[PDB]
Design a protein around this ligand. Structure first.
Ligand SMILES: *[C@@H]1O[C@H](CO)[C@@H](O)[C@H](O)[C@H]1NC(C)=O
Ligand SMILES: *[C@@H]1O[C@H](CO)[C@@H](O)[C@H](O)[C@H]1NC(C)=O
Ligand SMILES: *[C@@H]1O[C@H](CO)[C@@H](O)[C@H](O)[C@H]1NC(C)=O
Ligand SMILES: *[C@@H]1O[C@H](CO)[C@@H](O)[C@H](O)[C@H]1NC(C)=O
Ligand SMILES: *[C@@H]1O[C@H](CO)[C@@H](O)[C@H](O)[C@H]1NC(C)=O
Ligand SMILES: *[C@@H]1O[C@H](CO)[C@@H](O)[C@H](O)[C@H]1NC(C)=O
Ligand SMILES: *[C@@H]1O[C@H](CO)[C@@H](O)[C@H](O)[C@H]1NC(C)=O
Ligand SMILES: *[C@@H]1O[C@H](CO)[C@@H](O)[C@H](O)[C@H]1NC(C)=O
Ligand SMILES: *[C@@H]1O[C@H](CO)[C@@H](O)[C@H](O)[C@H]1NC(C)=O
Ligand SMILES: [Mg+2]
Ligand SMILES: [Mg+2]
Ligand SMILES: [Mg+2]
Ligand code: NA
Lengths: 322, 322, 322
């Protein structure tokens, strides 16, 4: 009966269209490269005011070289002119009553205890320690450099898909509405401007510059490179997303210590101990490309052929049986 | 004969179970993401004693920001108060007899030679050089800061599987037997404590803190994120492994030079030249996840179908022929 | 007719050889690992002359620790002895006529403006600013440290393929024609020498050390690890390639600012502001290995079987029809 092949031909048409759109949708005919080889170079611009001092790129930016990870110092605690010596630590947790509870057995991971219970002040008695004297008082409150919000982060990214030897950069003057020296990344009005306003990045990650500058934090300028190398070089485009990575028992925020080391005319050594709070930026470059390949096109093809081949039989069984 | 389909039905049962367990075992039905997007933040705590000086985080930790790569200085060679000038180098390899063998042709990659053969001491005659005077004597023996062993490395890691947009952190208070502020990673008793005792990491990598602190070395806190995103968020868990990366013609160990730069009241410049030996830590974040997908489930399915389909024929040939 | 199976047997022979060589060529029987876990340690050696000063590793290398990203300073602009204070900026773009155009509305991202239009010199009138005084004059011309060309970059790389737990290093004394302490990477005469002459790397990337040292730049020592773990450990070998990553509205080159911070006997603070130009090196470690696997061998096998199975029919149709 001719209806049997019009039933069969219909079977083939429908089933094969479903399969075809599914595999055509998932690019099963494509091999994929997911090991993006990126190089990141960053440049920060801005000047701020902290106390009655002006902070510039050399002052609040560390490291200075512009790696994929860099810090903009917003707040900082200065313990000026420390000197190797003996002095009572200021932390209440070192509170003692007698030199009997200031032995090595107490606070092992801590600083170096002399073994004397000394009077830091009249209201606290703490174990004495050898080290940079006097000790740091990390419990006071200090201002934050608000100008940092208008600072700007320029991200130049040069990536390479090595499986296809397809290298490209994120500087695209045609894709940017404005000039490169003056544009400013807006996810909508200019999503390819490589210049990000700090405060902008803070918002894109959904965070408040006040609390963030106060406690410090870690943000991620995520650069995504999802590309179809079957298409044009013009189509491999970077998409910027933004997220906070520290999120959140443990106290949020981010701070590190570094000393400026000065020496005296007679030769004794002294340093300015700096506990720095700021915003660390991590440029996370992800990317994956896909090219037409003979092999995955063939495994996907075989898959589709056999699949439709069983579908038409099971459907003959379901229709006939009904 | 009904035995033919009981022979055939048995064929199908057995062969199909083998194939089924193999593919079910290898998760061939799953697509996999192997491009983990990790952010690493580290914090070291401890104080040590070196000579009659106390070293703290600002002193022995570099860089101070807590990147994925950081150094804990254990030993260091100080050449204090160098000054641009002329002086005889101290290395025997620069030994000369006359200014005839101290020409540019000799030791090209080396320092800057003046061309004079001068008497460094009474027992060595070396070519004179222009630079930081006096020269470094990197052949003496110095102590090591043993307290570093009790120092602690806190690793906060925030990773993201971008193919499934599955981000998660390694801070897991439920998975940790003790509190987070006080736990200590033990591969067995607390394998999810993010705090690693330095000496502990040294042992997990199978190394002796004495020789290591003496010569310096490179260790890897490997964080593995093998995950089945078909399963629960609770199942994506990090596994910490540890390894030494420098291993091993070339001299083992690890050392770098940095100068503390000081200036004089009259304006001449002088620096403290520091050859630092220590332990570099590299947090190597690896990870791969797998989710059920229609496409790999289909290619794997087709594979299994055709495979069993040929197996039953070859087995009919082997049984019948016998 | 026996010719039908000699036609069919020929069909099978030819078609199956084509398919077989194609899949055997693409290693479809192999699973692949593309997430290389590399550790990079670098060491630079050399001394150069800048002005009448000698620069050594501690002077021109930053950071000093030898990460995967490091800078060799070739040129630098010194603004010595800056001091918080008030002074007219020197950039023409801050040119003013009256204090009316030196309000916060002007040059928002810039430094901190006092609001006074002051006379920097007799030929320029600029807005006054609070900060490090005097201001930087980044428009003059300075020399470059040419010795840097003969400097040497030693790259020790320890990678790990985690899907197969296959770790290995790039130090291969057997593969190197000469000793390790004295070899020098030549793509041809010694492609496994881990020591790269700076100038050499500059050439391999197709660049001129003069213009590059003048304006600074970013180069990539690309280490490739393409490996067949079905083969011997001796066959997993690294291949060094070289490329310039900044390439190229925006001004080429690379420069960053850092200050050396000095303090006075009476306590006022002053710094040497350094705008550094040099060559940044990025060791880009890529790698992918492939091992024989049951699963991809099976999907590829099924693929080939069905494929040839349809080929012989379409060819019977093409031959018969002809
Ligand atoms: C580490 O601390 C313990 C106290 O908790 C102490 O007994 C031990 O001596 C310390 N280790 C070193 C090497 O000082
Ligand atoms: C950039 O713009 C010019 C127009 O002058 C065009 O010819 C060129 O193809 C564009 N390049 C890309 C990569 O779009
Ligand atoms: C150096 O001078 C300071 C005060 O000027 C003094 O406190 C210190 O003890 C001196 N150094 C030595 C080794 O006496
Ligand atoms: C590099 O060293 C050689 C000696 O090995 C010397 O002849 C040459 O001039 C040096 N290159 C530069 C740029 O100084
Ligand atoms: C953590 O513990 C609480 C118990 O109070 C539990 O409800 C929660 O689901 C746990 N979270 C995870 C991720 O296990
Ligand atoms: C600065 O003073 C030191 C000793 O105080 C002296 O050696 C040096 O020559 C002086 N600087 C100059 C340029 O003379
Ligand atoms: C940022 O700059 C604008 C001028 O463009 C200024 O009005 C605004 O107050 C600045 N933001 C902060 C936080 O100072
Ligand atoms: C290195 O050379 C020695 C020859 O003494 C040889 O026995 C050894 O197998 C070689 N190792 C490799 C990895 O080629
Ligand atoms: C410190 O001395 C310098 C000159 O020696 C002077 O310019 C400065 O004003 C002094 N510091 C203070 C706070 O007066
Ligand atoms: Mg304290
Ligand atoms: Mg020496
Ligand atoms: Mg300027
Ligand atoms: Na298949």
């Amino acid at each position: 009966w001719t209806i049997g092949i019009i039933n069969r031909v219909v079977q083939l048409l429908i089933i094969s269209y479903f399969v075809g759109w599914v595999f055509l949708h998932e690019k099963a005919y494509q091999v994929r490269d997911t090991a993006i080889e990126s190089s990141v170079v960053t440049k920060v611009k801005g000047s701020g005011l902290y106390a009655n001092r002006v902070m510039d790129v050399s002052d609040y930016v560390t490291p200075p070289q512009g790696t994929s990870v860099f810090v903009i110092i917003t707040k900082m605690i200065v313990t000026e002119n420390q000197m190797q010596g003996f002095c009572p630590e200021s932390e209440e947790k070192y509170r003692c009553v007698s030199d009997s509870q200031c032995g090595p057995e107490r606070l092992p991971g801590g600083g170096i205890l002399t073994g004397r219970c000394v009077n830091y002040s009249s209201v606290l008695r703490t174990c004495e320690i050898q080290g940079w004297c006097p000790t740091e008082v990390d419990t006071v409150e200090t201002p934050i450099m608000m100008e940092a919000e208008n600072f700007t982060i320029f991200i130049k990214n040069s990536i390479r898909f090595p499986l296809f030897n397809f290298e490209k950069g994120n500087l695209l003057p045609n894709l940017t509405a404005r000039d490169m020296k003056t544009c400013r990344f807006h996810p909508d009005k200019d999503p390819f401007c490589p210049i990000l306003r700090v405060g902008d990045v803070v918002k894109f990650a959904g965070q408040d510059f006040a609390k963030l500058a106060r406690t410090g934090g870690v943000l991620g300028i995520k650069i995504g490179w999802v590309c179809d190398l079957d298409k044009a070089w013009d189509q491999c485009i970077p998409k910027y997303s933004f997220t906070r990575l520290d999120s959140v028992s443990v106290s949020p925020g981010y701070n590190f210590r570094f000393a400026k080391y000065y020496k005296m005319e007679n030769g004794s050594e002294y340093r300015t101990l700096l506990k720095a709070f700021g915003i660390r930026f991590d440029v996370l470059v992800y990317g994956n490309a896909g090219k037409f390949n003979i092999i995955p096109t063939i495994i996907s093809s075989v898959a589709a052929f056999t699949s439709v081949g069983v579908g038409t039989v099971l459907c003959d069984i379901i229709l006939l049986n009904f």
